[model samples]
Target: AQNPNCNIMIFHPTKEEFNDFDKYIAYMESQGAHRAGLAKIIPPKEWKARETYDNISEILIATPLQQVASGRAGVFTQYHKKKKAMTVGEYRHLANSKKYQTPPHQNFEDLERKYWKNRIYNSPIYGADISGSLFDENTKQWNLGHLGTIQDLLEKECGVVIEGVNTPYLYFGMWKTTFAWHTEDMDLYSINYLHLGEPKTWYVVPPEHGQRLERLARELFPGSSRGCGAFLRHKVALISPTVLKENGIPFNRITQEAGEFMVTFPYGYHAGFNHGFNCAEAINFATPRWIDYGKMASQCSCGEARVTFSMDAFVRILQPERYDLWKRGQD
Candidate 1:
């Protein structure tokens, strides 16, 4: 598979940042998009549904300590949420309004859920929700207002961003049950960093060898959650570089002590798992943006589940050309 045009950058904070975790935490909190606190371990029941930080703090604290001596210390936080739901007319009015910014709005969970649901069932090929004008997954949608201030100062950062005014999709989320293994749709730009707890295990495969490994995954693990076709194609090449010489498998054993490394894997197939016996507290932040791309495809495709037109879209139907931009901005 050809490498997708994307940029991935990772930075490790110096002693100035890591030496005092509190300082880094304070810096993250200042952004308003991030909340730093102790990890919460949700019971099996709560894990089934999405949970807020406060919902499972006790289980998060107790389980790690009881089962794994190495667990317990880490930060928990939510990265982003969609702002609000509005009719296409309202969203267009807002986008054109002076008060509206290019990547407008703040956090709202309702919209985020809607966007994710749409992406999961409607736009499976896109691999992301409609939250920007172009629907190009390669574009970065970081909170543009804060980017100028934080980009230079923080050596390490991760958070989500919204694009255009009134879009219902906030970029990303970090929670107990949330786990991401696939490489991004951008450039290979940063070093992988593990701020707290023991470093987790990651399998980084190179692109050239993707097809073979993908075949193996399909053949061995059919419908298993681990066997995702898209994910396999994206991560194979990146993992190849970190191969364990003895076994020829790119299973990099990363420890918390390793800190962070500038890893080159923009679209690599990689998965990380908590080493500690209990669920680990995880915090992730990133910068985002909008980039030019071809036409925005309909959310619904043949053989896929029917995705009812979003309220925003139904209202904008009178001006169908505007529908793409409307849904992109306001899910």
Candidate 2:
């Protein structure tokens, strides 16, 4: 409320500027982590979300996922939450032979196709959320995401493929797939692009109010307590925006449309819901200054979380090396 731009910055870049994807990632770095957006991205014909998931799965055997560990790589399901997670093979096995686990009318492949299509019709398809882990760096997939190049560079530092902050999450939610409120992992900046389908609604408690909320978590968020460390806990209970507003917490709300990019800055508490049939891709990155926060996040890390980066210096330091020196440093 203190600054109007403090909420979320919606960037309207000229066609020429928007065409330079690398600049998009760089902007996120320079601006810091504050939720942001890019107006209507027009893509090539092949990028239609319909072909994305299958196309990538066909190539990479190990991909990242938003769901708990061990569920069909890239697929999302909430059941695995309390039990820890399983491997890609374990979940795929369950999806295939487990009696109630596997949908009888459809195969795993078909199940995905149906789910993708279900989102377009747009409405809650129950309370489940799904994801296709990792981004494909091929010619086509790379061209699709404006930040793909940046993601690759981040992978060098946020190196741990799956659990690390650098991983990209493929989100496909029909309705109630809620990403809980928290500052970007390790206070790093994150940008999510609504590639296609329905819009996603977000509620952000500005950066200034963010710390107070962090201290106030004990009183909100599905009975969560400050002692529980909601700040970096992997399994956070999602609180609705309506609940935040009802509690008198000032929030900025917006519905993200297709072909737009949403960027979140450090210390901004953001949580949102897929209005309906939302298909989006997101990843995390950090500026040199993020070392302090990244180091801190690893302390309270929970479950599958880890200290993925081995480097602890400013971002500019990595650039001096031409070929060899850059290879070993990490966060």
Candidate 3:
């Protein structure tokens, strides 16, 4: 089957003939599907043997894990937002206080962990609650007020569809800091238009060439470990001219100028960080679509586990009614 919206096809085998799992494996190996060489493994301590050295050799050549950790003091300054330097713990305490409450569910420590993990492993910086409601103390539920403006901006400036009402919980905010690594997703175009301050970004090679990037990152930042295959294949685009060489050009170059928005496509994996301690603002939006309940169920075994009431299923279920709001946003 082919989706008309995205023009991508879904193929399913029609009949089950002979069991060809072994043949299928052979075919995959022939096509380089399983050819992700031993370079995927991290080096162990005490590499003495020839096999160990050979393994390390492949990793050394294939991995390009670059670490741009030069501005360590700058990162501390940004997190503390103070003239004097503070310990990482001190910075965490100050950033977690109510004075810096844009990130309602997270504190400076959470942001720090996320940034370091992403920087070291080249993973998507996850788990910073930037939901719009964090802005207003009186607000109790997630509201679309902030996202509404973002939707309007993207539609007007970026020529993309942003269904505000129907879009999922796409609202996010910065608390102490934010970070991402070179990565991508499967659907929708994404961009972060910085309305506040200069945000740093690391645009490495595509997912196919990330083995080299990961090696470089690992060497520069040793503790940051990530599996090359563990990263998701989300499409992304970077707005940095310096990172946009012909060998690895960003899908789109929104702008090199600071405080401007950068566009990213689905399946591109690019990470970002705030340049300083102050809060940064950006409009984040993606193309909205109807939820696929069947696919969701197939992916999750606990689909029907927490069935307390019909209303629970109705309110939280991935059905057309729930997605009607998302459809409205597409308008």
Q: Pick the candidate with the highest lDDT.
A: 2
Across 86-196, the per-residue lDDT of candidate 3 in tens digits comes to: 332343344445654333326444544445433322211112323222123332211123343434433554465534242222211223233334432212233342322
lDDT of 1 at 298: 25
Q: What is the lDDT of residue 235 in candidate 3?
A: 14
Q: Candidate 2: which stretches are off by over 4 Å?
A: 1-5, 19-167, 221-227, 230-232, 289-292, 295-331
1-331 in candidate 2: lDDT tens per residue?
A: 2234554555555544555565664564455323332222334433433445433323221322333322221122222223334443343343334331323334333443343343223223221223344334554333333344333444465663322223455564544345656676446666676765556777677665765556445554333344334433443444444445566666676667786667665566776555444457776655544445554442232223232343323222333332132233221
Write down the worst ten-residue block by lDDT for model 3.
Answer: 53-62
Off by over 4 Å in 3: 1-127, 133-178, 182-186, 202-258, 282-331
* For every candidate, C-alpha RMSD to the true structure in Å: 19.2, 10.6, 21.9
Candidate 2 or 3, higher TM-score?
2
* Higher-lDDT candidate of 1 and 2: 2
Best by TM-score: 2
lDDT of 1 by residue, 54-161 (tens): 322221111111011111112111112234444333333433344321222243333233322222221011011323221123322222121232222121332323
